[PDB]
Nucleic acid binder design. Sequence first.
RNA 1: GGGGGCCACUAGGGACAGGAUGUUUUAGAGCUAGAAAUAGCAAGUUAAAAUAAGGCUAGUCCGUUAUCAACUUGAAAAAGUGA
DNA 2: CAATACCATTCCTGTCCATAGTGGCCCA
DNA 3: AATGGTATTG
Length: 1336
Amino acid sequence: KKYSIGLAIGTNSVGWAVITDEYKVPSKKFKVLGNTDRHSIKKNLIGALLFDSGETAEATRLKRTARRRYTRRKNRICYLQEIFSNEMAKVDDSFFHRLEESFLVEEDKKHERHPIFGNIVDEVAYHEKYPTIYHLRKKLVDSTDKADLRLIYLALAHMIKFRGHFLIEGDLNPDNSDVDKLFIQLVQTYNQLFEENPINASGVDAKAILSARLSKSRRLENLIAQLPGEKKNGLFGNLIALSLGLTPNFKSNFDLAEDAKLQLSKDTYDDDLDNLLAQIGDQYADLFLAAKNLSDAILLSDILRVNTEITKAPLSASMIKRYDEHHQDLTLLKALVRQQLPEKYKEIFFDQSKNGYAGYIDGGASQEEFYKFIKPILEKMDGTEELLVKLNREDLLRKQRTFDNGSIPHQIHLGELHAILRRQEDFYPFLKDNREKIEKILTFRIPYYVGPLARGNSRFAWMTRKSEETITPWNFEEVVDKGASAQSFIERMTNFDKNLPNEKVLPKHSLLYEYFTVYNELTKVKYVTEGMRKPAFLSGEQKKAIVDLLFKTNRKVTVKQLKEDYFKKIECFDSVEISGVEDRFNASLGTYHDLLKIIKDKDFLDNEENEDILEDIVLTLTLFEDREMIEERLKTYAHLFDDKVMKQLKRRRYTGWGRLSRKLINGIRDKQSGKTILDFLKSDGFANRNFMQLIHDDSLTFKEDIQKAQVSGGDSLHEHIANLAGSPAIKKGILQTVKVVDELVKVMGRHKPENIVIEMAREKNSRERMKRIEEGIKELGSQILKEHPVENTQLQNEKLYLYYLQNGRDMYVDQELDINRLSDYDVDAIVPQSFLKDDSIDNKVLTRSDKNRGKSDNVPSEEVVKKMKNYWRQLLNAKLITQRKFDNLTKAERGGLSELDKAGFIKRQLVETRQITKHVAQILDSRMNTKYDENDKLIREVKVITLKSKLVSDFRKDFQFYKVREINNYHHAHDAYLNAVVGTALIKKYPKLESEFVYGDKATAKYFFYSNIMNFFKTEITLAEIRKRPLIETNGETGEIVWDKGRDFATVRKVLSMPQVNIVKKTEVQTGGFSKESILPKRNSDKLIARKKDWDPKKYGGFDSPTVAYSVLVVAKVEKGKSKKLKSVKELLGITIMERSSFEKNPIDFLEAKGYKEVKKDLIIKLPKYSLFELENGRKRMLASAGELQKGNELALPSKYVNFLYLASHYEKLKGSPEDNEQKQLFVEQHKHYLDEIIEQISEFSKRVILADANLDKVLSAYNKHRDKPIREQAENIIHLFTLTNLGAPAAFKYFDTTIDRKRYTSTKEVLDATLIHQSITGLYETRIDLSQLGG
RNA sequence: GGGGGCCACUAGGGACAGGAUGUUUUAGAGCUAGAAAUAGCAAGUUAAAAUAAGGCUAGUCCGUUAUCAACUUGAAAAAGUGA
DNA sequence: CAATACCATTCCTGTCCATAGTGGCCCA
DNA sequence: AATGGTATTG
Ligand SMILES: [K+]
Ligand SMILES: [K+]
Ligand SMILES: [K+]
Ligand SMILES: [K+]
Ligand SMILES: [K+]
Ligand SMILES: [K+]
Ligand SMILES: [K+]
Ligand SMILES: [K+]
Ligand SMILES: [K+]
Ligand SMILES: [K+]
Ligand SMILES: [K+]
Ligand SMILES: [K+]
Ligand SMILES: [K+]
Ligand SMILES: [Mg+2]
Ligand SMILES: [Mg+2]
């Protein structure tokens, strides 16, 4: 008894089938367990496991980190209160108690209800004097009077609890005023450097134009307008853009070739300014210098909208400006609405439901929704011009705690905190002694390279302590080993050397590593001249000379420099042919040139004595990112360099690690020669062996030493699958697949199959699209977003996305495109889809007409390339197209598509090469084949074949075994079946293909062969004339029969027509969040759940809508009526995720607390979601919850109706042949009565199983309404009708324009008397429990 | 040789440190006319506190991923059970 | 009970590691 | 996006 298994692996399904020698599907009697009269059941060996998607760890991580943040913010406030403890006790012994209980209702408050002062008079007076916290902040910053300790606490606590960002390193407020004079001085330095061409900035109000509460680019335009001449793209224009964002290429300004750009915020700024001044002269330094100067007073102008000379609290002053303008404009708006349009006053100022001022202050209306609601009301009235200006600048009636405060750096809050401490430390000594402690509370962050401050109970932590004691912000440097922690941060994530698994890899930018890469590339270079008989390698002396002359004087070495600067200069060759490198060397000594610029001592770099030193420096610069730790670690070399060089040196940093270790590169030595790997790369006689040859050559000891160093370590199956690189979604399917194969082998008497054939399906976002387009267009300098505004959702249209990615132009022709005629344009595949089935934006292009591409059987013609290469390069530099898209677009200037390329593409269409599928194949193969032969080589009893979906897809379409995904879930199982059939047949016919399709170890010819690989199934083949194949197809050598075109197609038809298919929805305990996150207001309802143990929801609000982890069958008694008489019940109790641990720790106590008595402990049945019940007439239901059910039956629609629906709907495309198109159309029209028959099948199924009477009647009327519609559209909507019958949760669907809402099953009472069906993973093994036999 | 190193991209996974909103209860004396219903008017921008209930291992830690038919012997990990 | 309509905390900055898809040089 | 919780209407 031999058999094969077909598998179809998806993100929500694993289809499986078992086939025999004749491509038939067996059927067995399987024993049925339980307490029903049914002892067995006939099962076909085909089906599909269904499951909800596996989820990533992301959401869990975001929640975990936000938790840690709330905990540490609370601890910040706690530190502050601990500082204030005793002196506050002297002033007001219950202030902090009032703060802590501020949330409680007056009934529950232990102290007086007014938090700050504990009496209504003083509290009301406080709020009158200080309407916002920023009033109190500014007063405490500016005033000199002794202030009440409680108000001091309130100001400092507000600064510490909402402390601003940390994106800016260093200290702040160097220049806060005289921006007018700074701008005059920048204009002055420009005029000094260009005495012939000066700029007159007299009268230019640079303050108002540049500190304008508007975008930077707009201010640039205005300022350039004020200066006569001086176009925005001139030198001074880009220098104004310097304080603004882009500061684009000065190459236009200085006529230099390479691209320039600067950004005073980037830490590469000093190096880029050096790189530029080396190209143009240090005399321009004062030009950027002054620029930087003028920037300092203006960089914060967006945040500090008030002069910095009347207050030392410009931020809080700006908030008070917000408040005062809010008040003035509110008075004015109220008066206007009273006068002009008095009927709307109530809707604006009283209606929270509307988006007026009421809904904006008291309702749920946002600033944007309010601006939208009030725009027309302001335009409709008079005297609202200034208010409309403030509205379109987003500065009308602003609150102070707003979504856009995220740009406030922590240094500003710190400045105000320090100012207050300085004012009041004169009166309170404890503020003087704790000034720096409080400042530290504000300024302290745990470094990202330290992680959680755990003590052995966090699986996420790596930090090591210098001593065992509580870490505070003030003793962090002493208790936490920052260096060891920062090291472990990297070393717990980096790979070891695979060849020497106990050796760490080198920094990618190590000098040694780059010597290795350069010599490895260089040793395989060959050259030919005239007198030479044969191309020669480079000798060791030649490689040393090329490294010293070229690689050590140029960052990048081109083949041209090799030919002219070495072979002509040293070898006196006029002509030489180079192989092994094209255009320019890929490897390069970048770090060598970095350190040469920094230290300016070529002899120091070239001295081998300093090798180790340099290796450490780069190591440090790689291992650490914090400037102080880098500095401390380089301190040991402070004696070798000048302080200027030490500063420049600690400035420069590297990221990334190599893949080889130092011991591999320049450590282990060959026994005979005594040479390291690098020594052979530098010189290897006449062989010039490279790295691979070196570690594989049996005449050397490197291979032996690597073998010896290797250690094997073992993961479990689940651990192994978890550690694969793939989506957790597909990993869930992989593990399910292995469990399914295990059960299937158990079903077949523990006999292993002959073949296993596996196919694997191919595998918010609009925000990424909008980001791409914004960046690319502002990098392009285009005004397309100015002239055509767009929202992210709109970019989900392919053509509009392409339009914006193409700067609104045609990509094959130099002309504009029209947004409104997008429907008339074309979307063309760069490399045609007949070769590369790629439908992504990386291979698609928007053009006015695909006809202009040229011939349709290749990449675009050379004319197009010549015309459009520069435009495409612009788009590439804007990151609007990728390098792959650009290269494919330009392939015609590189010979176009060759015949080898087309052969390869067609092979790719058939031979799977994704790593993840290969891992699935390896897993199955290592589980199935476990014995070794006499030569100790693996015995492959089971052949694991992998196929791509296109094989079986083309099969289905060519032999009319059509699939319709919406009818039911049987297509996953059928895919599995057809995979088994096609794979086994394919390798039976052509055994030599095993190398390609089985796991384990003339271009026209392969093109033809792989295009016609599947023709042995067809009876006649039309290929560019008509050829004919026999009725029986056999193997050429063995003579064995592989395919009987008569009987075997009938076998396949019979298998696809079988109604009994084992579809199983995997039952799962629900996990995750306890409930919806919405904190709801107070309500008289027991559905509300307290947010804290003592916060009664009827007084405080809270949560509702909790998630049931799993239901539980309870057979017990419950008290009834005022008498409390015991009454026997049987019902489903939903155990929520939050209740689950309590219920499981002791089920009886939990249930008795819920109200039940005398619980029959042994009749408690755990019922996860999707638990299956059968009732009468085969009607099935699945548990959706403790109080709702899902549809549980599959509609086994016959194959003739399935194929009719496919053909009539024009599912996919029917264009194979004109005459075959005609035959399909004729069959559709001849069998048009199949529409009524299909409606009848749906109706019978619904009346037996679905039981949505009203919905079925509405659907029947809708079908009888559109009987005159074309057959195509009626079929297309009949497809939609199956949403009524599909398995799972009920859903709404549409028949033409009629909408059918979901009919829900909002009661679980009936399943309590039905038959509960427990199913194994395949559903072949069942345990059926009659629940009606359970009762009181 | 579907292994390896390098170059150029692109896409996804994982961890950590931080920012701003939002929400919820309370505080921010509402006034006047009327028995009330209600009407007319005034006012509004701020804060505290919580932000999974909570847990013990008590850390400036942990609490939403992965994994799960039933039954048996099992404390549990497990292993076994049916053409 | 049964049907029906509404509801669902959001967005952002920075540091770092690995894998794997495409094209290319050199090899096992 | 879905689909299970919830209140409202009977
Ligand atoms: K009280
Ligand atoms: K001008
Ligand atoms: K609001
Ligand atoms: K190259
Ligand atoms: K680094
Ligand atoms: K020195
Ligand atoms: K889920
Ligand atoms: K789960
Ligand atoms: K109030
Ligand atoms: K199951
Ligand atoms: K929000
Ligand atoms: K992030
Ligand atoms: K590659
Ligand atoms: Mg907490
Ligand atoms: Mg808040």
